[PDB]
From Swiss-Prot:
Transmembrane segments: none annotated. Residues 8-48 form the UBA domain. The gene is USP5. Belongs to the peptidase C19 family. Homodimer. Interacts with TRIML1. Ubiquitinated by SMURF1; leading to proteasomal degradation. Coiled coil: none annotated. It is found in: Cytoplasm; Cytoplasm, Stress granule; Nucleus. Changing residue 19 to E: Lower affinity for triubiquitin and tetraubiquitin, but no effect on affinity for diubiquitin. No effect on activity. Deubiquitinating enzyme that participates in a wide range of cellular processes by specifically cleaving isopeptide bonds between ubiquitin and substrate proteins or ubiquitin itself. Affects thereby important cellular signaling pathways such as NF-kappa-B, Wnt/beta-catenin, and cytokine production by regulating ubiquitin-dependent protein degradation. Participates in the activation of the Wnt signaling pathway by promoting FOXM1 deubiquitination and stabilization that induces the recruitment of beta-catenin to Wnt target gene promoter. This is Ubiquitin carboxyl-terminal hydrolase 5. The UBP-type zinc finger domain interacts selectively with an unmodified C-terminus of the proximal ubiquitin. Both UBA domains are involved in polyubiquitin recognition.
Length: 74
C-alpha cells in the first residue's frame, strides 16, 4: 500500500543526504520544519547551510567539551 513508517520522513532525508548533505542536518530540517515535504525541508537547509553551524549536530546538553576550530584561511 504505502510505506507507513510514521514519525519523520527518512525518504526525504535520504534524498538530501544523497544530494551531499549531513544526515543529522538533514534530520534537523525535516524535524524543525516538522516534515513538510522536501522542498520545504531543503529551504530550511538552504537557509541553515548559510551558516557553518549547519552541519553541526542538534543542540547539545550544555556544551562542555566542544571539538571545533574552524580555520579562518584555507
Amino acid at each position: 500500500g504505502s510505506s507507513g513508517s510514521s514519525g519523520l520522513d527518512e525518504s526525504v532525508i535520504i534524498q538530501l543526504v544523497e544530494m551531499g548533505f549531513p544526515m543529522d542536518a538533514c534530520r534537523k530540517a525535516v524535524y524543525y520544519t516538522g516534515n513538510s515535504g522536501a522542498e520545504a525541508a531543503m529551504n530550511w537547509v538552504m537557509s541553515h547551510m548559510d551558516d557553518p553551524d549547519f552541519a553541526n549536530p542538534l543542540i547539545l546538553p550544555g556544551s562542555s567539551g566542544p571539538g571545533s576550530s574552524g580555520p579562518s584561511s584555507g
